[PDB]
From a paper:
C-terminally tagged constructs incorporating a TEV cleavage site leave five residues of the TEV recognition sequence post-cleavage, whereas N-terminally tagged and cleaved constructs leave only GS at the N-terminus. Interestingly, the C-terminal tag remnant formed extensive crystal contacts in both the C2 and P21 CHO-scFv crystal forms, as well as being crucial to crystallizing the scFv complex. In the crystallization of the individual antibody fragments, the positioning of the tag on the C-terminus resulted in a tag remnant after cleavage, while no remnant is left behind when the tag is on the N-terminus. As shown by both crystal forms of the CHO-scFv this contributed to the crystal packing, and its removal with carboxypeptidase Y led to a less favourable crystal form and no crystals at all in complex with Mcl-1.
Mcl-1 (myeloid cell leukaemia 1) is a member of the Bcl-2 (B-cell lymphoma 2) family of pro-survival proteins that regulate programmed cell death via apoptosis. Mcl-1 is an anti-apoptotic member of the Bcl-2 family which binds to pro-apoptotic proteins containing the BH3 domain, a short α-helical stretch of around 16 residues. Binding of Mcl-1 to the pro-apoptotic proteins prevents apoptosis. Here, we report the characterization of an antibody fragment produced in vitro against Mcl-1 which was formatted as an scFv and a Fab.
Residue numbers in the entry: 1 to 118, 136 to 254
Protein backbone atom coordinates (compact mmCIF):
# COMPACT_ATOMS: atom_id res chain seq x y z
CA UNK A 1 0.00 0.00 0.00
CA UNK A 2 2.18 2.83 -1.46
CA UNK A 3 0.38 6.22 -1.21
CA UNK A 4 1.01 9.92 -1.90
CA UNK A 5 -1.63 12.46 -0.89
CA UNK A 6 -1.43 16.16 -1.75
CA UNK A 7 -3.21 18.96 0.26
CA UNK A 8 -3.31 22.77 0.33
CA UNK A 9 -4.95 23.65 -2.99
CA UNK A 10 -7.75 26.15 -3.54
CA UNK A 11 -8.40 29.76 -4.65
CA UNK A 12 -5.69 32.43 -4.36
CA UNK A 13 -5.36 35.91 -5.84
CA UNK A 14 -2.51 36.74 -8.30
CA UNK A 15 0.65 37.83 -6.44
CA UNK A 16 -0.41 35.61 -3.50
CA UNK A 17 1.26 32.59 -1.81
CA UNK A 18 0.24 29.06 -0.96
CA UNK A 19 2.06 26.03 0.44
CA UNK A 20 1.18 22.57 -0.93
CA UNK A 21 1.91 19.46 1.13
CA UNK A 22 2.38 15.85 -0.01
CA UNK A 23 2.07 13.12 2.66
CA UNK A 24 3.78 9.78 1.92
CA UNK A 25 3.24 6.33 3.50
CA UNK A 26 4.12 2.70 2.71
CA UNK A 27 7.72 3.22 1.54
CA UNK A 28 11.06 4.53 2.75
CA UNK A 29 10.41 8.22 1.84
CA UNK A 30 13.95 9.26 3.08
CA UNK A 31 15.63 7.17 0.27
CA UNK A 32 13.82 8.62 -2.79
CA UNK A 33 14.05 11.76 -4.91
CA UNK A 34 10.57 13.39 -5.16
CA UNK A 35 8.92 15.68 -7.75
CA UNK A 36 6.03 18.12 -8.30
CA UNK A 37 4.32 17.92 -11.73
CA UNK A 38 1.29 20.03 -12.60
CA UNK A 39 -1.47 19.90 -15.19
CA UNK A 40 -3.33 23.12 -16.24
CA UNK A 41 -7.09 22.34 -16.79
CA UNK A 42 -7.52 20.65 -20.19
CA UNK A 43 -3.73 20.92 -20.87
CA UNK A 44 -0.54 18.76 -20.79
CA UNK A 45 1.76 17.71 -17.95
CA UNK A 46 4.35 20.22 -16.80
CA UNK A 47 7.15 19.29 -14.40
CA UNK A 48 7.66 21.89 -11.63
CA UNK A 49 10.51 20.83 -9.34
CA UNK A 50 12.57 17.96 -7.89
CA UNK A 51 14.39 17.32 -4.63
CA UNK A 52 16.85 14.52 -3.80
CA UNK A 53 16.37 12.19 -0.73
CA UNK A 54 18.55 14.46 1.54
CA UNK A 55 17.59 17.81 -0.11
CA UNK A 56 21.12 18.27 -1.52
CA UNK A 57 20.09 18.42 -5.20
CA UNK A 58 17.17 20.64 -6.16
CA UNK A 59 15.94 21.66 -9.63
CA UNK A 60 13.25 24.02 -10.91
CA UNK A 61 11.38 24.66 -14.14
CA UNK A 62 12.61 28.00 -15.57
CA UNK A 63 9.14 29.59 -15.22
CA UNK A 64 8.94 28.88 -11.44
CA UNK A 65 12.63 29.38 -10.53
CA UNK A 66 12.94 32.18 -7.95
CA UNK A 67 9.19 32.06 -7.03
CA UNK A 68 8.71 28.43 -5.88
CA UNK A 69 10.59 26.58 -3.11
CA UNK A 70 10.56 22.83 -2.79
CA UNK A 71 11.46 21.21 0.51
CA UNK A 72 10.92 17.97 2.40
CA UNK A 73 10.66 16.83 6.03
CA UNK A 74 11.98 13.23 6.14
CA UNK A 75 10.93 12.97 9.83
CA UNK A 76 7.26 13.72 8.89
CA UNK A 77 7.44 11.78 5.52
CA UNK A 78 6.31 14.98 3.84
CA UNK A 79 7.13 16.91 0.63
CA UNK A 80 6.29 20.62 0.25
CA UNK A 81 5.94 23.27 -2.42
CA UNK A 82 5.96 26.95 -1.36
CA UNK A 83 4.48 29.01 -4.21
CA UNK A 84 5.06 32.79 -4.26
CA UNK A 85 4.24 35.51 -6.86
CA UNK A 86 1.25 33.38 -8.03
CA UNK A 87 0.16 33.97 -11.66
CA UNK A 88 -2.99 32.98 -13.59
CA UNK A 89 -0.65 30.55 -15.48
CA UNK A 90 -0.05 28.62 -12.14
CA UNK A 91 -3.72 27.43 -12.19
CA UNK A 92 -3.37 23.60 -12.44
CA UNK A 93 -3.80 20.28 -10.67
CA UNK A 94 -0.46 19.66 -8.76
CA UNK A 95 0.72 16.06 -8.40
CA UNK A 96 3.34 14.62 -6.09
CA UNK A 97 5.61 11.88 -7.72
CA UNK A 98 8.29 9.41 -6.55
CA UNK A 99 11.42 9.00 -8.74
CA UNK A 100 13.31 5.63 -9.09
CA UNK A 101 17.04 6.29 -8.83
CA UNK A 102 18.32 3.74 -11.35
CA UNK A 103 16.04 4.95 -14.19
CA UNK A 104 14.61 8.41 -13.19
CA UNK A 105 11.06 7.04 -13.87
CA UNK A 106 8.11 8.58 -11.84
CA UNK A 107 6.65 5.27 -10.68
CA UNK A 108 4.14 6.43 -8.01
CA UNK A 109 1.93 9.47 -8.38
CA UNK A 110 -0.42 11.19 -5.92
CA UNK A 111 -4.08 12.08 -6.62
CA UNK A 112 -3.50 15.80 -7.24
CA UNK A 113 -4.67 19.07 -5.60
CA UNK A 114 -6.16 21.94 -7.61
CA UNK A 115 -4.75 25.45 -7.37
CA UNK A 116 -6.87 28.24 -9.00
CA UNK A 117 -5.27 31.70 -9.33
CA UNK A 118 -8.06 34.24 -9.99
CA UNK A 119 4.33 25.18 -25.97
CA UNK A 120 5.85 21.81 -24.78
CA UNK A 121 9.58 21.07 -25.44
CA UNK A 122 8.80 17.50 -26.52
CA UNK A 123 6.45 17.25 -29.50
CA UNK A 124 3.55 14.82 -29.67
CA UNK A 125 0.48 14.64 -31.96
CA UNK A 126 -2.40 16.19 -29.89
CA UNK A 127 -4.81 13.35 -30.93
CA UNK A 128 -4.64 9.74 -32.18
CA UNK A 129 -7.51 7.40 -33.10
CA UNK A 130 -8.01 3.76 -34.05
CA UNK A 131 -10.57 0.96 -34.15
CA UNK A 132 -10.40 -1.96 -31.62
CA UNK A 133 -7.79 -4.60 -32.51
CA UNK A 134 -5.62 -2.24 -34.60
CA UNK A 135 -2.07 -1.05 -33.82
CA UNK A 136 -1.43 2.65 -33.08
CA UNK A 137 2.02 4.28 -32.88
CA UNK A 138 2.47 7.69 -31.18
CA UNK A 139 5.65 9.69 -31.82
CA UNK A 140 7.56 12.00 -29.46
CA UNK A 141 10.12 14.30 -31.11
CA UNK A 142 12.80 15.99 -29.03
CA UNK A 143 16.29 17.28 -29.53
CA UNK A 144 19.93 16.36 -28.81
CA UNK A 145 19.95 17.59 -25.15
CA UNK A 146 16.87 15.63 -24.06
CA UNK A 147 15.81 12.45 -26.05
CA UNK A 148 19.21 12.53 -27.81
CA UNK A 149 21.07 12.29 -24.48
CA UNK A 150 18.67 10.66 -22.01
CA UNK A 151 16.13 7.82 -21.73
CA UNK A 152 12.43 8.39 -22.46
CA UNK A 153 9.59 7.56 -20.10
CA UNK A 154 5.88 7.30 -21.05
CA UNK A 155 2.93 7.96 -18.77
CA UNK A 156 -0.67 6.94 -19.30
CA UNK A 157 -3.44 9.11 -17.92
CA UNK A 158 -6.90 7.40 -17.95
CA UNK A 159 -9.87 9.94 -17.81
CA UNK A 160 -10.49 11.13 -14.24
CA UNK A 161 -7.22 9.61 -12.93
CA UNK A 162 -3.67 10.66 -12.06
CA UNK A 163 -0.91 9.63 -14.56
CA UNK A 164 0.73 6.21 -14.26
CA UNK A 165 4.12 4.94 -15.43
CA UNK A 166 3.75 3.09 -18.71
CA UNK A 167 7.30 2.78 -20.16
CA UNK A 168 10.67 3.51 -18.59
CA UNK A 169 14.32 3.55 -19.95
CA UNK A 170 12.86 3.79 -23.53
CA UNK A 171 11.42 0.25 -23.82
CA UNK A 172 10.98 -1.29 -20.41
CA UNK A 173 7.53 -2.14 -19.07
CA UNK A 174 7.00 -1.90 -15.28
CA UNK A 175 5.11 -4.67 -13.40
CA UNK A 176 1.48 -4.12 -14.39
CA UNK A 177 1.93 -3.10 -18.03
CA UNK A 178 1.12 -5.81 -20.67
CA UNK A 179 3.37 -6.58 -23.73
CA UNK A 180 0.69 -4.90 -25.96
CA UNK A 181 2.47 -1.60 -25.01
CA UNK A 182 5.97 -1.14 -26.42
CA UNK A 183 8.41 1.74 -26.54
CA UNK A 184 11.33 2.55 -28.80
CA UNK A 185 13.90 5.35 -29.18
CA UNK A 186 16.14 6.27 -32.09
CA UNK A 187 18.23 9.44 -32.22
CA UNK A 188 16.18 12.45 -31.03
CA UNK A 189 12.75 10.74 -31.37
CA UNK A 190 10.83 8.08 -29.46
CA UNK A 191 7.63 6.12 -30.06
CA UNK A 192 4.95 4.33 -28.08
CA UNK A 193 3.18 1.44 -29.88
CA UNK A 194 -0.16 0.00 -28.72
CA UNK A 195 -1.07 -3.35 -30.32
CA UNK A 196 -4.56 -4.87 -30.06
CA UNK A 197 -6.17 -1.48 -29.23
CA UNK A 198 -8.99 -1.87 -26.67
CA UNK A 199 -11.73 0.58 -25.54
CA UNK A 200 -9.94 0.90 -22.11
CA UNK A 201 -6.82 2.32 -23.82
CA UNK A 202 -8.74 5.64 -24.29
CA UNK A 203 -6.45 7.98 -22.32
CA UNK A 204 -3.85 10.72 -22.69
CA UNK A 205 -0.28 9.58 -23.30
CA UNK A 206 2.78 11.63 -22.32
CA UNK A 207 6.46 11.20 -23.12
CA UNK A 208 9.12 12.62 -20.74
CA UNK A 209 12.89 13.05 -20.75
CA UNK A 210 15.49 14.87 -18.72
CA UNK A 211 16.99 17.81 -20.63
CA UNK A 212 20.77 18.41 -19.96
CA UNK A 213 20.57 21.99 -21.34
CA UNK A 214 17.57 23.23 -19.37
CA UNK A 215 18.51 21.10 -16.25
CA UNK A 216 14.81 20.17 -16.28
CA UNK A 217 12.32 17.49 -17.01
CA UNK A 218 10.51 18.09 -20.33
CA UNK A 219 7.09 16.46 -20.98
CA UNK A 220 5.21 16.24 -24.26
CA UNK A 221 1.93 18.12 -24.75
CA UNK A 222 0.06 14.84 -24.58
CA UNK A 223 -1.70 12.63 -27.11
CA UNK A 224 -5.36 11.98 -26.52
CA UNK A 225 -6.02 8.51 -27.92
CA UNK A 226 -9.63 7.74 -28.94
CA UNK A 227 -10.74 4.14 -29.60
CA UNK A 228 -13.65 4.42 -32.10
CA UNK A 229 -15.59 1.61 -33.77
CA UNK A 230 -17.53 0.68 -36.96
CA UNK A 231 -18.44 4.13 -38.59
CA UNK A 232 -21.69 3.92 -40.70
CA UNK A 233 -20.19 5.77 -43.73
CA UNK A 234 -22.14 6.52 -46.83
CA UNK A 235 -19.87 5.42 -49.63
CA UNK A 236 -20.98 6.55 -53.03
CA UNK A 237 -19.56 5.17 -56.24
Amino acid sequence: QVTLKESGGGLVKPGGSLRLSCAASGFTFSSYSMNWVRQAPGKGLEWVSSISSSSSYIYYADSVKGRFTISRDNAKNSLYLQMNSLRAEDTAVYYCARQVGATWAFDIWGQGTLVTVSQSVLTQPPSASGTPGQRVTISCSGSSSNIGSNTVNWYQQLPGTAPKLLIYSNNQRPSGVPDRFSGSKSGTSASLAISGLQSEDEADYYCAAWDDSLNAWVFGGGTKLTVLGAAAENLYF
